[PDB]
Design an enzyme around this catalytic site. Structure first.
Site, short mmCIF file in Angstrom:
data_model
loop_
_atom_site.label_atom_id
_atom_site.label_comp_id
_atom_site.label_asym_id
_atom_site.label_seq_id
_atom_site.Cartn_x
_atom_site.Cartn_y
_atom_site.Cartn_z
CG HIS A 161 110.68 23.30 -42.17
ND1 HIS A 161 109.60 24.09 -42.49
CD2 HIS A 161 110.78 22.31 -43.08
CE1 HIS A 161 109.10 23.58 -43.60
NE2 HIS A 161 109.78 22.50 -43.99
CG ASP B 294 108.78 26.72 -40.39
OD1 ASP B 294 109.98 26.90 -40.66
OD2 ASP B 294 108.08 25.84 -40.92
N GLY C 235 108.70 19.64 -50.11
CA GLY C 235 109.41 20.34 -51.18
C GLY C 235 108.71 21.62 -51.59
CB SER D 3 108.81 23.77 -46.91
OG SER D 3 108.07 22.68 -46.43
N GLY D 4 108.31 26.85 -47.54
CA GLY D 4 108.89 28.16 -47.80
C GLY D 4 108.14 28.87 -48.91
C1 LIG Z 1 109.78 21.51 -45.06
C2 LIG Z 1 108.54 21.43 -46.06
O1 LIG Z 1 108.94 20.92 -47.43
C3 LIG Z 1 107.29 20.69 -45.51
C4 LIG Z 1 105.98 21.00 -46.21
C5 LIG Z 1 104.74 20.92 -45.38
C6 LIG Z 1 103.70 19.89 -45.85
N1 LIG Z 1 102.50 20.62 -46.25
C7 LIG Z 1 101.14 20.30 -45.91
N2 LIG Z 1 100.23 21.06 -46.37
N3 LIG Z 1 100.79 19.29 -45.19
N4 LIG Z 1 107.23 20.87 -44.08
C8 LIG Z 1 107.39 19.74 -43.24
O2 LIG Z 1 107.48 18.64 -43.74
C9 LIG Z 1 107.39 19.91 -41.69
N5 LIG Z 1 107.07 18.72 -40.89
C10 LIG Z 1 105.79 18.05 -41.05
O3 LIG Z 1 104.97 18.47 -41.87
C11 LIG Z 1 105.52 16.78 -40.22
N6 LIG Z 1 104.23 16.79 -39.61
C12 LIG Z 1 105.68 15.54 -41.07
C13 LIG Z 1 107.08 15.39 -41.68
C14 LIG Z 1 107.24 14.25 -42.66
O4 LIG Z 1 106.50 14.18 -43.69
O5 LIG Z 1 108.14 13.39 -42.46
#
Ligand SMILES: *C[C@@](*)(O)[C@H](CCCNC(N)=[NH2+])NC(=O)CNC(=O)[C@@H](N)CCC(=O)O
Ligand SMILES: *C[C@@](*)(O)[C@H](CCCNC(N)=[NH2+])NC(=O)CNC(=O)[C@@H](N)CCC(=O)O
Ligand SMILES: *C[C@@](*)(O)[C@H](CCCNC(N)=[NH2+])NC(=O)CNC(=O)[C@@H](N)CCC(=O)O
Ligand SMILES: *C[C@@](*)(O)[C@H](CCCNC(N)=[NH2+])NC(=O)CNC(=O)[C@@H](N)CCC(=O)O
Lengths: 242, 244, 243, 243
Positions: B44, B91, B192, B194-195
């Protein structure tokens, strides 16, 4: 609504605006009145997480947002059980009003299509709403209801277009059977248009073909708008709606 | 990173920062160095739509973001073919570095787990990164690398938690088999991050259990962080990345 | 406007809205119709730097912003020659409309006060506009015209208040003679209310005492709103506007 | 700083960063170390309203903001008594450090100019800081200290330029004797550079000519940067700061 024009007062009596409580009863989604006590919208508007019904009101057909507000309370939100994210299907929801509405000629219900209707390309379809006029560009005051004629696209053509300039395997489906495609680079729905109806005139009747669901940006090349196919969910709709 | 503390200079040598070109080479994602020429990240971050490789650089383990930048170009981005949205699985993505890295004691690779490792609850796991410290709260300058010990959760418990205060049918799976759950209301990864790697110490070795993928907010009640399960994608990883 | 309520359709016929061209004709300032082809506004709205007259329109008294727009072009902007910054005085401007307006009972002019009127404390004064409803909080749709009754304060009292919790020497005037003070912590004007009229009912007549100019925040303690004193600029006004 | 380049570690030892407490000790203004216990800055940074000294720290010369922070508390803020707004003069303030600094070769004071120095046009002057790199564009991480050579302009030339495309009367002085002008459309100071020093090399010595004060935008045509003239305020400075 990207493209199109302001809708005349006579057209689209089934159009509804969903309001969320804050510094004011703000428009966040569209919807259609499918029965005097039932509004059909998109699930991503109200789910997957449960919201307070007290902070939600419904506004029936009005030419300019917020001008002559007559806000109606909601007794129940029914989100399709198979829903979690818009792109992965089941992006459909029903809202039951506290009381039924006295349907006039200016404000009345839309007809759902028969299970067999496929809506082939070259069908005259309209999408209406008060959503963004372009990418990150809000609809300016006095917030008129807009309308745009959108060209229907064959699902497989649209799925192929979504694979252009994407890493997703060609054998992996982006656009599914519970979905419908419409629009181009001049004509599309946008953010705040979700839940709004995609209507087509078939045999002199206005039927609701789809519900504004998702897309990659607004009116971007090789990214037409994706709508939830109403025919696919008629059994689920009729389990609650007469 | 929600909770935890600043990581010491000795810990997490495999941690990497992905940079996107703009007014500066901005951090947008984390990743882990799994091989001297390969970075494991989340899909993503770089997909589903194809981006220009020229506008992407990799920064290896650094204590404070942007202060001692030595940016590396990327020759290839490989996104899992089954990916479109984070919540619906696959992902995972790989980045091949244009040049291999001279692995030191301060900067070296992470070990991928054996196919059989399940990572049961009560496992000592850490998640590291330079993501948001809270919901809509960016990591403040000088941008230190943060670390947090996160409690592993069984997928069925986690899938049940995700159904609480949700309209989704109980028979519909939210947390799939290619996913892993970790964290609570005090400890979690954020935007931020992610990954970024979820590492566990198993038999005196640091194994990468997961890749930061998604969640509903950061450290929200009954919403633990969802990670991509690395074991599930070993065959796909090893189709590009050497085993040894 | 901070405090108060929505104004009835009958009240404030002299209220105007100044519009700037962009994605729409956006409200940025208020003003008052002082003559059928003259609008009194604040200079900080239109100056000190010269703007294009083409990108400026005037909207007369309307209950809800943007719903029933009948936008009028402007032929001339006259900014007081002494003006550069709002706090340092001369924050007054005149807009000349291309054509005079047909004044109705719903839309007509405000009376300027006689040179001698001082507006002592305890005077019943109102400030009207479509400005911010609080600090960094915009007026929400359908954008009703808001009104608030504000208590007048003596200039020497008000200048003393502006010196509390300030580094400025007590002998240095912050609140000049060309200024007027009004409001408290519950009642005040805000951003987007500038140029707007401060009106007082004197001997059964509505007179414009001031023009919304500046202040430290909106409804902050010991920081009442500062208005340009219309009496101080009557000679300058009457050099362009017929009495 | 609009234009210029990153400053080498050897140059500008007197440069300081003023920090405000929030989610972190954020840079908001520049300044210069004029004495081991005294920082010279702009009054609009810290005034006209009194702020909590607890929420304010001083950071001495550092190449990259926030990396190696060694934040110093402030005991006293002395704002010029004639100050209220930047454009209307007296935009100067002094900060007294809780304790004096051990001045090294990398961190030491700037020489104040002698009362007679006028700084005529064609003088080689530099302005330094960590302010905006353009209009509404923040300095990007790792936040290097920037420097730009700025052309000095005669005050009358400057005042005339400020009257072009302005409603202000030609006989109304916008740029006054307590002010100095510098910069063009390629070279200027910006927001966050305020308090920052304007230094000129005169007779092989680095003299502080001005303090970053105000302007209409950053590097806009016919709008050079306005600095507070240090020579004008030497008597006020020396009432608190030892010679
Ligand atoms: C792409 C990456 O930085 C994030 C990190 C995940 C958040 N971690 C935890 N533990 N909750 N991935 C995303 O944001 C993927 N999409 C979502 O998480 C959505 N449910 C919400 C997106 C949003 O905050 O706008
Ligand atoms: C919920 C609703 O207001 C929007 C609007 C539908 C967009 N329609 C077209 N034709 N583009 N639906 C969503 O936000 C669902 N998610 C997405 O569309 C994302 N894939 C894109 C997000 C974005 O670009 O802002
Ligand atoms: C131009 C006009 O809309 C405003 C509003 C006057 C504010 N009224 C009260 N009671 N505070 N006038 C200005 O913005 C002129 N400058 C200032 O008021 C500044 N001293 C404060 C700036 C700010 O708070 O944004
Ligand atoms: C407080 C300080 O950081 C700034 C810097 C002045 C801008 N410098 C140059 N060379 N252009 N000082 C101010 O913001 C004081 N007020 C103004 O500059 C106003 N005339 C413009 C309004 C604004 O941009 O803030």
């Amino acid at each position: 609504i990207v493209g199109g024009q302001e809708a005349p007062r006579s057209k689209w009596p089934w159009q509804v605006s969903l309001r969320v409580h804050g510094p004011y009863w703000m428009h966040f989604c569209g919807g259609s009145l499918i029965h005097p006590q039932w509004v059909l919208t998109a699930a991503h508007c109200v789910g997957p997480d449960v919201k307070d019904l007290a902070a939600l009101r419904v506004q029936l057909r009005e030419q300019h947002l917020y001008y002559q507000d007559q806000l109606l309370p909601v007794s129940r939100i029914i989100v399709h059980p198979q829903f979690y994210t818009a792109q992965c299907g089941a992006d459909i929801a029903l809202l039951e009003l506290e009381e039924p509405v006295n349907v006039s000629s200016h404000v009345h219900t839309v007809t759902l299509p028969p299970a067999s209707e496929t809506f082939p390309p070259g069908m005259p379809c309209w999408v209406t709403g008060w959503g963004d006029v372009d990418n990150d560009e809000r609809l300016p005051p006095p917030f008129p209801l807009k309308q745009v004629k959108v060209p229907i696209m064959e699902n497989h053509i649209c799925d192929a277009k979504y694979h252009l300039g994407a890493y997703t395997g060609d054998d992996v489906r982006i656009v599914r059977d519970d979905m419908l495609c419409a629009g181009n680079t001049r004509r599309d729905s946008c953010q705040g248009d979700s839940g709004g109806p995609l209507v087509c005139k078939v045999n002199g009747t206005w039927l609701q073909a789809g519900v504004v669901s998702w897309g990659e940006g607004c009116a971007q090349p090789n990214r037409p708008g994706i709508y939830t196919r109403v025919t696919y969910y008629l059994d689920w709709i009729h389990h609650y709606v007469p």
